[PDB]
Write a protein that binds this DNA or RNA. Sequence first.
RNA 1: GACCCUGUUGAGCUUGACUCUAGUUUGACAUUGUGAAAAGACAUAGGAGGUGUAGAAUAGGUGGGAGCUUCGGCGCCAGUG
RNA 2: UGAAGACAUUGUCAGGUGGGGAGUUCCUUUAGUCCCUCGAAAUUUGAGGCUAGAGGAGAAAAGUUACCACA
Lengths: 95, 96, 177, 63, 356
Amino acid sequence: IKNKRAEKAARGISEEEMFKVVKTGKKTHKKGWKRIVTKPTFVGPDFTRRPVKYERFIRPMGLRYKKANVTHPTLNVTVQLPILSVKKNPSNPLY
Amino acid sequence: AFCKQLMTLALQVPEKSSQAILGLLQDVVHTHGRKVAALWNTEERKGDGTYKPLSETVEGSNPFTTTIWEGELLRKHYCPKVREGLKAMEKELRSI
Amino acid sequence: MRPLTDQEMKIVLDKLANYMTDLKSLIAPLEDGDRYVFRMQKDRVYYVKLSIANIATCVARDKLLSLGTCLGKMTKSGKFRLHITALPILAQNARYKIWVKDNGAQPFLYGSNIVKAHVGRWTEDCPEHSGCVVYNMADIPLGFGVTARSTAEARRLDPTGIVCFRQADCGEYLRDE
Amino acid sequence: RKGNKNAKLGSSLVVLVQKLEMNAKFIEERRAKVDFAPKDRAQVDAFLKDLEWEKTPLGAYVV
Amino acid sequence: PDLQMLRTRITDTIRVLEDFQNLAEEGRSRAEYTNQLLKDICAYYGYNEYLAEKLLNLFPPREAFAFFEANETPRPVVIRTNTLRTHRRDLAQALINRGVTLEPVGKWSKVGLQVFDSKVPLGATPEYLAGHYILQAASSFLPVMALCPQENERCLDMAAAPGGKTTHMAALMKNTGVIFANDPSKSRAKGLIGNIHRLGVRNTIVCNYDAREFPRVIGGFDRVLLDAPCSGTGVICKDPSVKTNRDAKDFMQLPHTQKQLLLAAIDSCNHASKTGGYIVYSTCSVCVEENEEVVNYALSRRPNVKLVETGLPFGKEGFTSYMGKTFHPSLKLTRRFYPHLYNVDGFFVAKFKKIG
RNA sequence: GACCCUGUUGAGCUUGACUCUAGUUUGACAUUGUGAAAAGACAUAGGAGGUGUAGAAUAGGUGGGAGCUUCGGCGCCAGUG
RNA sequence: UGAAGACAUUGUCAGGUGGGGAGUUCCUUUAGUCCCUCGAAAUUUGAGGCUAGAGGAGAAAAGUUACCACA
C-alpha cells in the first residue's frame, strides 16, 4: 500500500476568524455566546456556510482529524485511511 | 434611456435642433462617461433581456442591452455642423 | 401550486413595499400581452411569468421543485420572509441604497452587520428603520437589510457602530451548495 | 378607424408599415454579431457592402 | 510487483508493436505482444481487464499510452462567465485584481476562462456570489454550442443536476422563453435550484421526473438536450472508481437506458417548429457501445430524424465501422474529444433534426 | 456558567382521502380553395461507392471454394486480423 | 353592400395537472414458479404483470426536533 502511494505521488478561512469578523459588527456580546466544541471533530470541506442552527458551535482547527488507523479483521492488517463522513455518534444526535 | 432616445430624436429633427441635441449629449457623455460608455461598446452590452423601444416607463426599457447605431446616419447628414457635432461626441468618448 | 389569497398577497406586498418603490411595475403588462404573477408552492412564494405558470401546470405538484424567482417563504405563524433569491428584484427598484467598501464586503458576505467603517456611500434622507439594499463599490448587489439609525444620526456615529442590520447575504448560496 | 372611409388608403398604409417592420427585423438579426467599439470600426464599415437594395424586404416591395 | 519495471515493459512492448515487421523475437506472435501490453497496462494504471482491452481496441498503441497518461493527470479548472450579468473582460480583470491568474480557455469560446492559480478561494469570491461566473468543465460547454437556443423558444434539459448547461441555455436565450430543467434526484436538484437563483435565471422550471416520461408530461419542445448517464470513461480523472467497477453487466444496461432516453428526446421535440427541431445527445464516455451505437439505433427506428453538422470548431469524426458493426454513413458528422488530444474531458456530441 | 422542562418564534421533516370537473396545458384530426416557386419522402431505369487499429493495401456483407488461368500471373498455405 | 383572409376562431378524440368547484365513504421494497407482455443483444438482460407483507373526515390545520432566539 505504501509503495503504491509512493509511485502515484511521483507521477478558505477558519470558523474562529469568521466568528471574529461577525462579532465585530455585533459589538454587544451576549454572555456564553461562543460554544467551543472541545471534542475531536471531522469536517471535510475547507470552506462552508452553516445554518443558523449550528453557526454558534465553533470547532477549533487543532481538534480536527482527517485520517484514522483502520484495522481489517479478516485481512489482519491496519492502514491509515482517510475519513469520508461521520454516520452516527451513539451519544448525541447533535454530535 | 434618454441617451438612446435622444440619438433617435437627432435623426429626424431640423438641422439646428439636431445640432442642439448633439451638443447636449456631448456634455452628458463628458460629465458622466462610464455610465453611458457601454452604449457605444458592443462587447459591454448587457445580455439580460431585449431592448424595448416603446416602453411605458424609463426603467421598463432595457437600454443597456442595445447599442447606439445612429452614428452611421448622422455621419452622412447634410449639415456640416451636425457632422462636426457628431465627431465632437465620439472625440469625448474616445477620451473617456 | 396555487395562486395567493387576498390575505397572503397583502402580506407579500407589504414586505416588498418596505424595500422597493414602484410595485406597479412588477405586475404591469409586458409587450407581448403577458404579465408576472405570484404563486405558492410548499409555503414558498415564486415570482414568475404567467405564461410559464400556465405551462408548469403539467408538472405534478409533488414533482415540482422551483419556478421562476423565489421571493421567500411564508412562516408557520403566517409571516412573509424575504430570501436572497429575491435580491435581483429588490435591487431593480430599491428605495434606499447603501454601498460598502472592500473591507466591509467580505464581512457582510460572512454574515455581519454593516458598521460605519464599512460604508462608502449613503442614501440621503433615509429614516431610522428602513429597508436598504447593499452594494459594493462596483455597484454589485450583495444583499439587503434594515437600517439601524437615520442617515443624519449615523454620520455622527462612532466607527464601530452598527449602521445597518443584516437580513440576507449572497453567502447563503454557499449554504445550500 | 375609430375619420374618412378610405379602406384602400388604410390598406395601403397597413401594408406599408408591415414592410417596415420586416425590414427593421431584417437588419436587427444581421447586426446582432457586429463589434462597434469606438476605437476599431472595421466590421461596421463593411456591414452590408456585398448586398443589393433589391434583396431587402422593403426592396422586394418597392419593385 | 516493481511498478517502474512495468513502465519499462509498457514502453518496450509499444515500440515492438510499432515495428513488429523487423524487430520481433524468435516465434512469439504479435497476438501475445498485445496481450502482454494488456497485463502491464492493467497492473500499472489500475484498470481491470474488461475496460482496458476495451480502451486498447479503441486506440492504436502509442495514442493509447497517451490516453492512459492523460487520465491520471488532473484537468485545468475553467469557469464560465454569466452573460446575464457581465462579459469576459471585466470578470478576468475583476479576478485579476483579486489575485487569480486567467487566460481565455481558447479561441472557440467567448465565454470560458482558464485559471492557473489564485490566492483566494475561487468558489467564494464576491463576483462568484454575485452570479458572474460558475465553475464548469470545458466538455460541458460543447453540447449547448451544438444546441444553440434562440430567444422565445421552449427547451427541455433532461439531466441538469449540476446546472452548468441549463444556465448556459438561459444565457443564450437571454432569460426569455421557457427551460424545463429535469433531475430524477431530489438531492442533486437542490444544487441546481441554488445555481439557477445565484446566476439570475428567471425562465426555468425545475421538475423532478424520470426523463422517459416527458412526452407524456408535456411534449412539443423546440430544442431538447440529453446528457445520458453513462459509464464515465471520459471523466476517469475525477472518478477513479470507473477504472475497476465497470464490467460487461454495466455496459449492457447502460446503452439500453440511453437508447430509451434518446427515443424519448426524439418524441419530445416538435418537427414543425418555426425556429428549430434540434436534438443534441451528449455523453462523457468514449466507448462505442455508448456512442455511435445509440445514435445508429435512433436513426434505424426513427426514420423521421437526420444527423446534421454539429457546428463545433474542433473535434474528431465519429466512427463509421467497428468490431464487425457497420453504422449509418451519416455518423461521420458526430464528433469526439479526448484528453490527450485536447485538454478536455472525454466527450461525445451528436445533433439531430426532426422532420416528421 | 453548564444541566432538565414549558410557552412563543425561527430553521427543518411528515401528513393533509377518493371519483368527476372549471381553469390551464401537449399531440393527432376536420372545415378548406386555386395556381406558381422550392424542399423531403415514396417509383422505376441507370451510374458511382465503402479508407477507426493491425494487416503490403480502401475488408460492404453473405456461400460454396483448392484450384483458375487471353496460360503468367495468381491461389492455397504462412501471417495480421 | 364594403374590409380582412385559406391564417386565426371553432369543433372531435387521446393524454398531463388540478391546494380551486360538485359528490361519496399509482408507483417502490421483500420471497417464489423461471408463469405472460414490452424493450435491448444475440448465444442474455432490464421494466412491467401474478401470489401476500410493507410506505405514502382530510386545505381546516395537525404532528415532530438532545437545534436557534426570547420569556
